[PDB]
Design a protein around this ligand. Structure first.
Ligand SMILES: [Mg+2]
Ligand SMILES: [Mg+2]
Ligand SMILES: [Mg+2]
Ligand SMILES: [Mg+2]
Ligand SMILES: [Mg+2]
Ligand SMILES: [Mg+2]
Ligand SMILES: [Mg+2]
Ligand SMILES: [Mg+2]
Ligand SMILES: [Mg+2]
Ligand SMILES: [Mg+2]
Ligand SMILES: [Mg+2]
Ligand SMILES: [Mg+2]
Ligand SMILES: [Mg+2]
Ligand SMILES: [Mg+2]
Ligand SMILES: [Mg+2]
Ligand SMILES: [Mg+2]
Ligand SMILES: [Mg+2]
Ligand SMILES: [Mg+2]
Ligand SMILES: [Mg+2]
Ligand SMILES: [Mg+2]
Ligand SMILES: [Mg+2]
Ligand SMILES: [Mg+2]
Ligand SMILES: [Mg+2]
Ligand SMILES: [Mg+2]
Ligand SMILES: [Mg+2]
Ligand SMILES: [Mg+2]
Ligand SMILES: [Mg+2]
Ligand SMILES: [Mg+2]
Ligand SMILES: [Mg+2]
Ligand SMILES: [Mg+2]
Ligand SMILES: [Mg+2]
Ligand SMILES: [Mg+2]
Ligand SMILES: [Mg+2]
Ligand SMILES: [Mg+2]
Ligand SMILES: [Mg+2]
Ligand SMILES: [Mg+2]
Ligand SMILES: [Mg+2]
Ligand SMILES: [Mg+2]
Ligand SMILES: [Mg+2]
Ligand SMILES: [Mg+2]
Ligand SMILES: [Mg+2]
Lengths: 116, 70, 101, 87
RNA sequence: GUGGGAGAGGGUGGUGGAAUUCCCGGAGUAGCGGUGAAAUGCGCAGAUACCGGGAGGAACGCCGAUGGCGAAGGCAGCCACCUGGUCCACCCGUGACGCUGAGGCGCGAAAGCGUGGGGAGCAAACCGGAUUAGAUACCCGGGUAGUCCACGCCCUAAACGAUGCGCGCUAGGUCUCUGGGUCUCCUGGGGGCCGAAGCUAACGCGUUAAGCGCGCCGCCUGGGGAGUACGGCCGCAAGGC
């Protein structure tokens, strides 16, 4: 109900899923979506398409919150990480900055066998 | 796009306090720069490392930054 | 003794009473620790690359000294005690290795 | 460390003539000094093995020079052991 | 001896940021996670994704290498202290003081043991989930020892260059780390590649010899039985020689 109209949009892109959170210029989240937010269930969730529908959903949601001009934060890697920024530009929100924030460690935690 | 030594004067390689020169050795992100691109020598680059690390620990230099466009 | 450089960054939001107090205290450290001062540079407000104690900035000091080998480590402990002091970095002096010379 | 004239005072004390840097007596004294430092270092820091090696080695050299004195001039070897506190 | 140098050689205190877990808070809804596809699992006691604050442990991105140091095992943030080894220059001091080394003594990855701490992530055993003919297996979700620290044991390995140490001697070429020089280059000292002569069963080795020679130590003598059995010695035990 806030009429926010400018703000942050995050793409957290996994190998398994893509989630997109919209937020206000100090960072508190307006709305969000994901692949399972829409119908898609399993593997289907991490497709690029699903990334795109997620982008679009969250955008439509925030546009109804009042959004237009939106600076982007990418975290993650994987199918339609890119396709979600592609559907974000395509939204009818103005993509202002695009910025890749993916956290990397300066190397302290051991990972899962899966991961070395 | 030739190297960074190629554009610069005598500058202390041990000056941890001199940011203006040192920044010019790092990535668009925070990452200290490869030799291929800083054009130093082994001993040179190896010193540029320890200095940069020193200055970082001192707050006048980035440990990491955010990557722009993409 | 040996040739050292004491590095002090402290709270940029200081006024007079506060700051020249931290500084009389630093002077009183070096005095008490067997530390002669060669030369001093106070650079003050500088824009840090990252927040140190929630602060977007910092207050810079450089004190070049000569003092005992054994005590330098103790020197920097009793210097870091300061609440208001954000970082102490001490170094041994090295001649100035040049580059592109 | 061992500073310079820290070492000098030892070479002066131990040379057979003015100007002798490298005699046996001197070599051994310098050894004894360096040894002794090291042994004090490793009283503390007993967890420092890589230096201890250097101590065995140190000691070894000193002893080989000693056996050479006793061999060659048993007199100066008494002399040296006296001054030094050794063997 | 003097004067220089390079280095993740060791020990000890300190300190820095990235990330993971957790707790506290804000905002926000219906999922997240996971796979070949799934399920177990967490989520309406509000997860996930997001912003802020705190706690704790562990390891140090880029630099980083075909790099460096060490006798080996091994050693990587930064800082300081305490130290070992080593290289070059000068040609100054000693005057064969050398090499090797049965035994002895010391070091010795990981796992393992004792006592006491610590415990974020990971993770034998274990508990569950799918796969499959079937599961203890590969894939998935939990998880204890352990991993980390101190101190004391343990002494093993593809502990590997599967190549014992020292010295002299036998074309070069190219790449490189690090000294020196009067610096297209010369001259030490390391790491590599190719290649004279030579060696080699070949493969390959080749001034970093697997070539030509001397010294000394270690070891071998068909495949099994067997690194077993017995015996001794060490070990708290596991077990080791
Ligand atoms: Mg998925
Ligand atoms: Mg010297
Ligand atoms: Mg080291
Ligand atoms: Mg160390
Ligand atoms: Mg449930
Ligand atoms: Mg947080
Ligand atoms: Mg806790
Ligand atoms: Mg790398
Ligand atoms: Mg090895
Ligand atoms: Mg040294
Ligand atoms: Mg001579
Ligand atoms: Mg003579
Ligand atoms: Mg004779
Ligand atoms: Mg024998
Ligand atoms: Mg032996
Ligand atoms: Mg262990
Ligand atoms: Mg057990
Ligand atoms: Mg234990
Ligand atoms: Mg315990
Ligand atoms: Mg598991
Ligand atoms: Mg199972
Ligand atoms: Mg099967
Ligand atoms: Mg797990
Ligand atoms: Mg062991
Ligand atoms: Mg090997
Ligand atoms: Mg032989
Ligand atoms: Mg040169
Ligand atoms: Mg050279
Ligand atoms: Mg060579
Ligand atoms: Mg060569
Ligand atoms: Mg060859
Ligand atoms: Mg042939
Ligand atoms: Mg052939
Ligand atoms: Mg040879
Ligand atoms: Mg047989
Ligand atoms: Mg037989
Ligand atoms: Mg028998
Ligand atoms: Mg037996
Ligand atoms: Mg017994
Ligand atoms: Mg066994
Ligand atoms: Mg056995």
């Amino acid at each position: 109900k806030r009429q926010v109209a400018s703000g942050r949009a995050y793409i957290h892109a996994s190998y398994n899923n893509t989630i997109v959170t919209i937020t206000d210029p100090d960072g508190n989240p307006i709305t969000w979506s994901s692949g399972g937010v829409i119908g898609y269930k399993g593997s289907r969730k991490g497709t690029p398409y699903a990334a795109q529908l997620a982008a679009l959903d969250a955008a439509k949601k925030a546009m109804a919150y009042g959004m237009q001009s939106v600076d982007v934060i990418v975290r993650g890697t994987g199918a339609g990480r890119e396709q979600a920024i592609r559907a974000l530009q395509a939204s009818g929100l103005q993509v202002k900055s695009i910025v890749d924030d993916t956290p990397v460690p300066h190397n302290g935690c051991r990972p899962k066998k899966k991961f070395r | 796009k030739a190297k960074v030594k190629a554009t610069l004067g005598e500058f202390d390689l041990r000056d941890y306090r001199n940011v203006e020169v040192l920044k010019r050795f790092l990535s668009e992100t925070g990452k200290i720069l490869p030799r291929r691109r800083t054009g130093l020598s082994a001993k040179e680059q190896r010193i540029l490392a320890k200095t940069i690390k020193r200055a970082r620990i001192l707050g006048l230099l980035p440990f990491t930054e955010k990557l722009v466009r993409k | 003794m040996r040739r050292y450089e004491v590095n002090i960054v402290l709270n940029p939001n200081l006024d007079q009473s506060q700051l020249a107090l931290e500084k009389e205290i630093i002077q009183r450290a070096l005095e008490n620790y067997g530390a002669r001062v060669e030369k001093v540079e106070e650079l003050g407000l500088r824009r840090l690359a990252y927040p140190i104690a929630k602060d977007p900035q910092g207050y810079f000091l450089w004190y070049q000294v000569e003092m005992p080998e054994d005590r330098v480590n103790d020197l920097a402990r009793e210097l870091r005690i300061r609440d208001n002091v954000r970082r102490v970095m001490v170094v041994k002096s090295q001649e100035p290795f040049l580059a592109n010379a | 460390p061992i500073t310079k004239e820290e070492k000098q005072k030892v070479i002066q004390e131990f040379a057979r003539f003015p100007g002798d840097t490298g005699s046996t007596e001197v070599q051994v004294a310098l050894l004894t000094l360096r040894i002794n430092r090291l042994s004090e270092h490793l009283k503390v820091h007993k967890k420092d093995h890589h230096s201890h090696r250097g101590l065995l080695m140190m000691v070894g050299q000193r002893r080989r020079l000693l056996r050479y004195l006793q061999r060659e001039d048993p007199e100066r070897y008494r002399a040296l052991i006296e001054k030094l506190g050794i063997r």
